[PDB]
């Protein structure tokens, strides 16, 4: 994606999903016998996800006005929005679209839970 | 199964009961193999282990594979790492829950907590998908009001909610079915319902054309015709 | 499981707060309800003694008033059910419903066999003028001569909690003219006194029935809300127990994982 970003085009990258990447890193690190952390995840998973997340940007006109946009996906288990990986990724991301199973079965689809959802860029991104 | 698929050229039907134990085996050897324990003691390699196992169970250009896998759920807690990893691999999932089985309704499939890729109208046709949508919505509405029911009784709801709850409690039982294998366990003859009859029956129930019947008529019977027959049999 | 018990806890707690606030509100309104009941009973009882001097005796019109305000016990519907049974046992009658809850209950039992439009009254305690106006409107569309048999269906407080439906017939104007057992009473046939006494009787009986039903309804809603608070407390306690057990279990899993990590 950075090729499109740096050459003045616009690209959006979707990760489906970063939690399984973290699980793969947990396996890899544990078999390297690095010390475990919370919930047996390795001690630098935040430094993992942040390195991926920070690459999203819109470049200034000094570098051709290109942009890379990220839309990662997280599979929370049992609604544990406070879990280690969800907590870190929430701390990292600009805004969160929360999807609630209860609304989905209630026929409201695509079931975005508006009250919990947040966007920081907000009004600057919408068309007038 | 793979040799039959790739060499004989036949389509094959593969049953695996129950695949969960595979992962559990990996746990047992994990400590003696010297791995650091993963979450709740599972082996670190769980994800790629199940991958190397189950990515082999797939249709290919050389032949079709239809497979049914059943997973034991420790403590009936679906959040356990093994079933949670397993969800990613299945095209269709139908959770069985003690919540309905303890009430004695069988086969006790959870009509809310299940999914399939073929649900969309592009496959079943709109007339089927709409009935599916309204069935799920009705059951979910009943569940959402069930908390209040406990405190204010069935009389407290408005007419719309009360009628919706009546429809929901009818439907929830109408999903029950006497399996041919289950005769031993139930004394009820087995009933097999074709898909079109099922869609028609649930559309009929939602459209109010069979509203008046007591709940007991829907329980352990297949097809609306046999529901009517049981209604008459219970009236006698 | 943990989050499910948390959400159901939140729902139960919300409903319980509603129950407690409504409990205090109904407890406050009950006193004025009772005082108005006593006044109406005294007045209509004097009227009833004046009738007793006559030794009163008997499509028929039945008027039943149940407060439109919901959140009460089943009693509001139950009386509507009881009269419905009385309707079944006497198909010659005609039914009139004076309230929203009774209107809903009757609509499920006899939507079009007989029609009498009444609504919007249950927002406040009864008053003599309201009952008189409602009575004048009630017989206006169906002459009393077309309904010589009459019935009024009300609720009475068997106790602070207990409630009991009952009724008292409206003595028709034709019946008031027949002077059954009233031979000793002073009369003047030149006057409208029969019809005037009919209309006054209908107004006073409407007032008495409304007052009795209203006091019984307020008492019933208070008692029902107390029972609701009881059930809500049981609900919250049980889910709280399951809540803390589940929390300890998950924390135990986390503890075990960190313990095994450290030892290696």
Please sum up the structure shown.
This is part of a larger assembly, with chains A (128 residues), B (236 residues) and C (264 residues). Chain B has 236 residues and is mainly alpha-helical. Chain B has helices at residues 2-8, 20-33, 46-54, 81-86, 98-101, 121-124, 126-152, 159-174, 183-186, 195-206, 224-235, and strands at residues 12-17, 65-70, 92-96, 109-116.
Protein described:
This is part of a larger assembly, with chains A (128 residues), B (236 residues) and C (264 residues). Chain A has 128 residues and is α+β, with helices and mostly antiparallel strands. Chain A has five helices and three strands, in the order H-E-H-H-E-E-H-H. Chain A has helices at 2-6, 18-31, 45-53, 84-92, 101-105, and strands at 10-15, 57-58, 67-72. In chain A, strand 2 and strand 3 form a beta hairpin. Chain B has helices spanning 2-8, 20-33, 46-54, 81-86, 98-101, 121-124, 126-152, 159-174, 183-186, 195-206, 224-235; strands at residues 12-17, 65-70, 92-96, 109-116. Chain B has a domain at 119-236. Chain B contains eleven helices and four strands; from the N terminus they run H-E-H-H-E-H-E-H-E-H-H-H-H-H-H. Chain B has 236 residues and is mainly alpha-helical. The longest helix of chain B is centred in the middle third of the chain and has 27 residues, at 126-152. Helix content of chain B is 49%, strand content 11%. Chain C is α/β, with parallel strands linked by helices and 264 residues long. Chain C folds into two domains: 1-24 and 225-264, no CATH class; 25-224, no CATH class. Helix content of chain C is 61%, strand content 9%. A four-stranded mixed sheet of chain C has the order 2-1-3-4. In chain C, strand 1, helix 2 and strand 2 (93-97) form a beta-alpha-beta unit. At the B-C interface, helix 7 of B face helix 1 and helix 6 of C. Chain A: It comes from Saccharomyces cerevisiae (strain ATCC 204508 / S288c). Chain A: It is found in: Mitochondrion inner membrane. Chain A: Belongs to the ATPase alpha/beta chains family. Chain A: F-type ATPases have 2 components, CF(1) - the catalytic core - and CF(0) - the membrane proton channel. CF(1) has five subunits: alpha(3), beta(3), gamma(1), delta(1), epsilon(1). CF(0) has three main subunits: a, b and c. Chain A: The record marks 117 as: Required for activity.
